[PDB]
Symmetry: C3
Subunit: 106 residues, 3 copies
């Protein structure tokens, strides 16, 4: 895959979380999002393909994926506590972050 | 924000945690600390401005913020479980680590 | 402590987790594992000693610690919740990750 496909996986699992019926489904979707966010952190997005891997721009990109990963980590804790609705609330902020990253790096 | 301002945010919120009366205040302060540590990962302390962004020294700096982030996450999980006093002890350890990073890079 | 020392610490604490009977023992071993993994993340492993610090190889090396750390903390949250055997299974997965990293970069 690639960065774009990782972003598509993030969006798909956000859609799954929105429609989820139980904590197991939210946990599964958030786990998939965690894996996808890491994989995207290892990629180079289209806008930064003219920048070096250790440029400040790419370092900041990887930190942005760290931010997304921490939002996922905390939402996953909230889901493992069984609070499905609050985990969906946190997934809303997840959606905001993912959209901003898509607009910034595509 | 620059590195010093992020460290100041960390210390202000440590003070907030020290004097908190409920889990909500602790959680708010810890969320602010997480945001500040992540933002500081994108900064450069003044004495490392001549180093390359991926130099061993800058790697040590960013990973120090990773250390802080996992300690913040511990305190946040404790707060989520209602364990305010354990979260405050964890925040005392966090204050020690923030001080050590400050002394190391200033 | 160099990278190899950190790997040996991770392996030792995995052995500790395997034979633990209570959650406090598991939590202690996992805390030590987090410390060792974050120490290793800032290192240059033996196989990559001839590579630039800005090389994509070192970036991938560091990003590979994201998985290790989030698996450590999956196990640690399970241990904080008192699920000893579940934490031990999570630590088995973590052991897979640790040994793969060790043998990849030595
Ligand atoms: Bi937790
Ligand atoms: Cl880097
Ligand atoms: Na609980
Ligand atoms: Na027994």
């Amino acid at each position: 895959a690639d960065w774009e496909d990782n972003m598509e996986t993030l969006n798909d699992n956000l859609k799954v979380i929105e429609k989820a019926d139980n904590a197991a489904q939210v946990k599964d979707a958030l786990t998939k999002m965690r894996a996808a966010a890491l994989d995207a952190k290892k990629a180079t997005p289209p806008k930064l393909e003219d920048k070096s891997p250790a440029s400040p721009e790419m370092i900041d990109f990887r930190v942005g994926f760290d931010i997304l990963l921490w939002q996922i980590h905390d939402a996953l804790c909230l889901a493992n506590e069984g609070k499905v609705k609050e985990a969906q609330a946190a997934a809303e902020q997840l959606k905001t972050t993912v959209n901003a990253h898509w607009q910034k790096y595509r």
